[PDB]
Amino acid sequence: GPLGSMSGGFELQPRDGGPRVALAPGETVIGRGPLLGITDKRVSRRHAILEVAGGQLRIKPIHTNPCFYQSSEKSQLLPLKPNLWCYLNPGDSFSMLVDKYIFRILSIPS
């Protein structure tokens, strides 16, 4: 029959060892601001959107200054396509600059 609901939450782990950030259900706009403590003026205050729903995490870059993605299996942060949602797997990383503000996706309970 019908599959029903799926749970599962997410946390961001900064590559530089800063504190982890748990994500709320639904959409969270990320970028320069107090949530992640990013202050570099090259990151927009409305840089990307993250969405947690149904046990999945997706990201959408929303600024001309891009976001980057590194699959857990690979070794280079590469640009994400502008303005498109992309699912992120636990263990993957994304970043707000090519070489700074890099976060690994961890799986946690909802």
Partner: peptide, 7 residues
């Protein structure tokens, strides 16, 4: 965080 984004 009041300053405009650098492009």
């Amino acid at each position: 965080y009041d300053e405009s984004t650098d492009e």
